[PDB]
């Protein structure tokens, strides 16, 4: 089924929105979150989920490169259509961590995924039109900052 996700007859976002493809990579994401190997480190994400469920943290942190090794095209789809991919990765992380920490939904309703160590970096003068609707990493200085207020509730800034 993973190879079938490579074979695409539509646009990148169009293929993902298909319910069969969405459930296909949902299973593929679910498989990886518990199955990984780092030689001596072995399944580091098993410990990552362990300490995250220990803290009941809402911040679901993932390293970018690790996903691209076990699941080659799964990480690249995440990069090209981050909104569509993270939408279901919210549910997959919820169900995968509930394999280790069930009844997590009893207290927290959602699991927003925090990507880390994304390799491609852009400056504020390099944001081309082609970079729209894509995951980007930029660096700068905090000039203006607003307060904390709830949004239609959850915090917003």
Partner 1 sequence: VKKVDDVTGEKVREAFEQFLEDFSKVYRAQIEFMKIYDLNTIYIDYQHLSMRENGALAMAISEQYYRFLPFLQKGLRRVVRKYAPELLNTFQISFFNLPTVHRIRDIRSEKIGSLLSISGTVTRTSEVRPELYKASFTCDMCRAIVDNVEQSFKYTEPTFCPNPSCENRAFWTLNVTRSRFLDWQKVRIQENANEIPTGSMPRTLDVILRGDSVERAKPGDRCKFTGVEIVVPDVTQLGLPGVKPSSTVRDLTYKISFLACHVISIGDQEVFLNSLS
Partner 2 sequence: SRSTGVPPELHVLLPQISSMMKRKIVQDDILKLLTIWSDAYVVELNSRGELTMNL
- Contacting residues toward partner 1, per CB under 8 A: 128-130, 133
The number of CA neighbours under 13 Å toward the Cβ of 99 is: 13
Cβ closer to partner 1: 103 or 129?
Answer: 129
Pattern 69-88, partner 2, x by CB under 8 A: -----------x--------
Q: Return contacts of 121-127, CB within 8 angstroms, 24+ apart.
A: none
Judged by DSSP in three states, 119 sits in coil
Discontinuities in the chain with C to N beyond 2.5 Å fall right after 152
Task: Give the nearest distance from C-beta 127 to partner 2 in angstroms.
Answer: 13
By CB under 8 A, tell whether 134 contacts partner 2.
yes
Q: How many residues does the chain have?
A: 157
Cβ closer to partner 2: 106 or 128?
Answer: 128
Residues near 55 by beta carbon (within 8 Å), at least 6 away in sequence: none
By CB under 8 A, tell whether 120 contacts partner 2.
yes
Taking CB within 5 to 8 Å according to partner kind, which of partner 1, partner 2, none is near residue 133?
Answer: partner 1
Residues that bind partner 2 (CB under 8 A): 65, 80, 117, 119-121, 130-131, 134
């Amino acid at each position: 089924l993973e190879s079938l996700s490579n074979v695409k007859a539509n646009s990148y976002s169009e293929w993902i929105t298909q319910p069969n493809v969405s459930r296909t990579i949902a299973r593929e994401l679910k498989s990886f979150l518990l199955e990984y190997t780092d030689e001596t480190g072995r399944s580091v994400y098993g410990a990552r989920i362990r300490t995250l469920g220990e803290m009941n943290s809402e911040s679901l942190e993932v390293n970018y490169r690790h996903l691209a090794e076990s699941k080659a095209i799964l990480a690249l789809f995440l990069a090209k259509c981050p909104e569509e991919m993270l939408k279901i990765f919210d549910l997959v992380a919820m169900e995968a961590t509930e394999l280790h920490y069930p009844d997590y939904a009893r207290i927290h309703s959602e699991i927003h995924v925090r990507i880390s160590d994304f390799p491609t970096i852009y400056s504020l003068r390099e944001l081309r039109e082609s970079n729209l609707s894509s995951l980007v990493r930029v660096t700068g200085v905090v000039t203006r900052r607003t307060g904390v207020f709830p949004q239609l509730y959850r915090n917003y800034q």
